[PDB]
Amino acid sequence: SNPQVYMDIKIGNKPAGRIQMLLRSDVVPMTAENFRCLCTHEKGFGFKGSSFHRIIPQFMCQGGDFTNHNGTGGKSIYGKKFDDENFILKHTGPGLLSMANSGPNTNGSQFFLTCDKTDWLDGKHVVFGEVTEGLDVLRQIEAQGSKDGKPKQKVIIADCGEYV
């Protein structure tokens, strides 16, 4: 049954609160499992201490690049990259989890949290989960965005894990 995970967010030197997310293992099991493991660090690496390096107001907050911290890095639990499982889940509104990529079948660890309906990404990025608690914390992340995506203050995943 669908995993639930959390990230505790720190903005600048200040704790912002916790985002809780439901992962859609029923629809995209490989994609959900990757993100789950990256929250728990059970495969030896993951999101803790990494940043949201690209934040665009009214669009999305992107993170998961825990190797290069700039959108060029990251890795999945399966290797550097894995296939797009399917595009069943659509970018219908804010608070959705979706995989960042560099073209078809290039999923690694980078992901974004949507801040509005982003339907122009449908069929291009794999949606795999949703925020169940802490939409307000996501809005605090978004508040640090700029049009060119540069964060105004550092946004860090201070802690993360699974409810299990």
Residue numbers in the entry: 138 to 301
Sentences from the paper on this structure:
In order to understand the molecular basis of these results, we sought structural coverage of the entire human cyclophilin enzymatic class. All cyclophilins share a common fold architecture consisting of eight antiparallel β sheets and two α-helices that pack against the sheets.
Clues in some cases may be derived from the identity of other domains expressed in tandem with the cyclophilin domain; for instance, the RRM domain previously mentioned implies an RNA targeting function for PPIE and PPIL4, and likewise the U-box motif of PPIL2 implies involvement in ubiquitin conjugation pathways. However, data were collected for the remaining 13 isoforms, and binding to CsA, CsC, or CsD was noted for six isoforms published previously (PPIA, PPIB, PPIC, PPIE, PPIL1, and PPWD1). Additionally, the NMR-based assay does not require substrates to contain chemical modifications, and can be used to measure effects of amino acid substitutions at regions distal to the target proline not measurable by other methods. We detected binding and turnover for at least one of the tetrapeptide substrates tested for PPIA, PPIB, PPIC, PPID, PPIE, PPIF, PPIG, PPIH, PPIL1, PPWD1, and NKTR. For instance, the residue that is at position 103 in PPIA varies from alanine in about half of the cyclophilin isoforms to a serine in PPIE, PPIH, and PPIL2; an arginine in PPIG and NKTR; lysine in PPIL6; asparagine in PPIL3 and PPIL4; and glutamine in RANBP2. The division between “deleted” β1-β2 loops and “full-length” β1-β2 loops follows a phylogram distribution of PPIase domains, with the more conserved isoforms relative to PPIA (PPIB, PPIC, PPID, PPIE, PPIF, PPIG, PPIH, PPIL6, NKTR, and RanBP2) encoding full-length loops and the more divergent members by sequence (PPIL1, PPIL2, PPIL3, PPIL4, SDCCAG-10, and PPWD1) encoding deleted β1-β2 loops. There are three distinct classes of conformations adopted by this loop: the PPIA α1-β3 loop family, which includes PPIA, PPIB, PPIC, PPIE, and PPIF; a shorter version of the loop represented by the structures of PPIL1, PPIL2, PPIL3, PPIL4, SDCCAG-10, and PPWD1; and a longer version found in PPID, PPIG, PPIH, PPIL6, and NKTR.
